[PDB]
Amino acid sequence: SSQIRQNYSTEVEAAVNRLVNLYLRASYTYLSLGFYFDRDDVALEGVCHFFRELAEEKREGAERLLKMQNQRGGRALFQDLQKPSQDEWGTTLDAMKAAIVLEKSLNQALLDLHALGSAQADPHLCDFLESHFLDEEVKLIKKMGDHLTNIQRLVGSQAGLGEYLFEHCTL
Amino acid sequence: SSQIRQNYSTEVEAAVNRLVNLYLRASYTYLSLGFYFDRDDVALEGVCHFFRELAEEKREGAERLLKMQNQRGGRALFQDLQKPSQDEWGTTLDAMKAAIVLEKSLNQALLDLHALGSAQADPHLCDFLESHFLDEEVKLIKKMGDHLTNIQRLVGSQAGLGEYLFEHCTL
Amino acid sequence: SSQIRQNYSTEVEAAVNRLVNLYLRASYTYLSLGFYFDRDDVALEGVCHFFRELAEEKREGAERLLKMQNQRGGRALFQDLQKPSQDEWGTTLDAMKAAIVLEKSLNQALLDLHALGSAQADPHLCDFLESHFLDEEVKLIKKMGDHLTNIQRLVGSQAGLGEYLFEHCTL
Amino acid sequence: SSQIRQNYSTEVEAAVNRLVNLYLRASYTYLSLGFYFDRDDVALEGVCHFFRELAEEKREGAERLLKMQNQRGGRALFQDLQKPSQDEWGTTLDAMKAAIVLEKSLNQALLDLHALGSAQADPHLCDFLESHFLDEEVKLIKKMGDHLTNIQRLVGSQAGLGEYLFEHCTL
Numbered sequence A, B, C, D: 001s002s003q004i005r006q007n008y009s010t011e012v013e014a015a016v017n018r019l020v021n022l023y024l025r026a027s028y029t030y031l032s033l034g035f036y037f038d039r040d041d042v043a044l045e046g047v048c049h050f051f052r053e054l055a056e057e058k059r060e061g062a063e064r065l066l067k068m069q070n071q072r073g074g075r076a077l078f079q080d081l082q083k084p085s086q087d088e089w090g091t092t093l094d095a096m097k098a099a100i101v102l103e104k105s106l107n108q109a110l111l112d113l114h115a116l117g118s119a120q121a122d123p124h125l126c127d128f129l130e131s132h133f134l135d136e137e138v139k140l141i142k143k144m145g146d147h148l149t150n151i152q153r154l155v156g157s158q159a160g161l162g163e164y165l166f167e168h169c170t171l
């Protein structure tokens, strides 16, 4: 029971529980990514730390959603967390591509949740997504695309490697 | 006269004046609540201070609205402030229930103002309500509902009182 | 492939992956427990914070195991995380009993892993469990049993409540 | 003569003297490795410093064993230190492979000493190996395997070199 619920549709409440599941799944994905790069036969600890920090941010996003669910008087319902889609993640390039795919899917889920909140005339929900999720996700995707470009440049060629060093080491 | 007014409908201007009245009324309600709990025959100074702080927050909300009215080039119009609905407020439980009723009514007025601003295509108004009012009101209502649950638990029973002390004193 | 693996049996490697799954499951359980106590109709924030901290400790335990798996040259394999066994957790007493059941099961898994490491003559594994898991788990279970006794005393009776206050407030 | 010896078998006492010899031999190996990389025609001072620090750690391990031998009432007996197996150590890759071979052999000697202490029911010995040697050796081997992977990646190819720079310079 709740004595506080106001203007909070069952549709949104359900969608928020699904979004918590997606965020926790993504956190689990990034946990797997990070420990893959910590393998002795891979050994790119910087890549390990990049994904470890993303695992933490996606868990924090889920916790924010759960806190909001309780603030509106909705009820958290948890489902199974499906294991990540791969057990080994290939090259740095492969892993950064998988990460962008994952983030695009979370972004689309955020946009879908906004469409539902708009249809339900739920401005608190909209505000919440704007305050904590929409711009954070755009920033992250921009950083990943920048990373993808630089991995491609570096693994591709000696001119590529040259331009990278000029920017990174001289500038 | 105004030389600055742009995209600011007479409907919104009127609705904002009504919302100032509601906020000032709520401030007056909380003033009455607080001094009731300061009576020698009631003497719950912590409850007095809780309502005294709410009186201050509701006055501040009204002042924010008035400042916004002037920033958009609308004209503040004041009406009578109706005295609060009771002269004595009963138990702590009774008073917390009345407070949640009051906050729900302010929240609904905020949602109604958003619906009007949306119909008038007034995004500055929407932004304003998001920046200062929607999440503040949800947070406050959540706190009041938490309080209601704890008052009910405490006044209800020895098991209730027991669980409360474990949480509050041990944890 | 690994160039470092030495004295690390496939049986232990598999058992460690299963133990990571159990720890992550327990973390997920505690996440559900904590947000249950944050509901407006439950509203025991101290209990919420107790379980929130346990969720963090169980995730940290899983991460320690994963780091150890990589240090020995074993390969992390993740499975589905089954959702927690309940959606609502009843009283504080009910929830503390469920927590002790959960911790007893992790403790038994640690003891089973020691039995396997002993049979495989793997002293590094034994050392690892001693350094990070066995005494931590005994300490936690002792704290939970202490909590269970105090909840029982407090919810049970006016003599019980009296003895608790003497200890907590006077001493 | 000793007035303190208790539960300290002649077998363990002998094995500990042999382990001191192995540790001092390894220290001597690393001394040779380090000065090889300081040659003007090799000139990788970072590699020199890596091996110089390992020479120091292996000497410290021997000194710890000798101190323990005296604490149990056993008698240190020293043998010849055989010169290192090579006079020149080839590439960085060659030298890191030789180092991992050396560390694997010390690790196996530690495991063999644990097997003997277990057969002799000598828990102080076991504790000692756990406190100062088993996890230190696993950590070191993990670091060396990580190094081997990164040397292989770097000396192998332009894609390899690219991935390394992304991790090391960008992340």
Ligand SMILES: [Au+]
Pocket (backbone or CB within 6 Å): A033, A034, A035, A038, A048, A049, A051, A052
């Ligand atoms: Au990682």
Ligand SMILES: [Au+]
Pocket (backbone or CB within 6 Å): A034, A038, A045, A046, A047, A048, A049, A050, A052
């Ligand atoms: Au890392």
Ligand SMILES: [Au+]
Pocket (backbone or CB within 6 Å): A113, A114, A115, A117, A118, A125, A126
């Ligand atoms: Au929206």
Ligand SMILES: [Au+]
Pocket (backbone or CB within 6 Å): A117, A118, A121, A122, A123, A124, A125, A126
């Ligand atoms: Au909306």
Ligand SMILES: [Au+]
Pocket (backbone or CB within 6 Å): A165, A167, A168, A169, A170, D169
């Ligand atoms: Au650079």
Ligand SMILES: [Au+]
Pocket (backbone or CB within 6 Å): A168, A169, A170
């Ligand atoms: Au540079």
Ligand SMILES: [Au+]
Pocket (backbone or CB within 6 Å): A168, A169, D169
């Ligand atoms: Au550089």
Ligand SMILES: [Au+]
Pocket (backbone or CB within 6 Å): B033, B034, B035, B038, B048, B049, B051, B052
């Ligand atoms: Au007052």
Ligand SMILES: [Au+]
Pocket (backbone or CB within 6 Å): B034, B038, B045, B046, B047, B048, B049, B050, B052
């Ligand atoms: Au007061």
Ligand SMILES: [Au+]
Pocket (backbone or CB within 6 Å): A123, B113, B114, B115, B117, B118, B125, B126
């Ligand atoms: Au609006």
Ligand SMILES: [Au+]
Pocket (backbone or CB within 6 Å): B117, B118, B121, B122, B123, B124, B125, B126
């Ligand atoms: Au609007």
Ligand SMILES: [Au+]
Pocket (backbone or CB within 6 Å): B165, B167, B168, B169, B170
């Ligand atoms: Au208390």
Ligand SMILES: [Au+]
Pocket (backbone or CB within 6 Å): B168, B169, B170, C168
């Ligand atoms: Au207390």
Ligand SMILES: [Au+]
Pocket (backbone or CB within 6 Å): B168, B169, C169
């Ligand atoms: Au207290």
Ligand SMILES: [Au+]
Pocket (backbone or CB within 6 Å): C033, C034, C035, C038, C048, C049, C051, C052
């Ligand atoms: Au919580």
Ligand SMILES: [Au+]
Pocket (backbone or CB within 6 Å): C034, C038, C045, C046, C047, C048, C049, C050, C052
């Ligand atoms: Au909490």
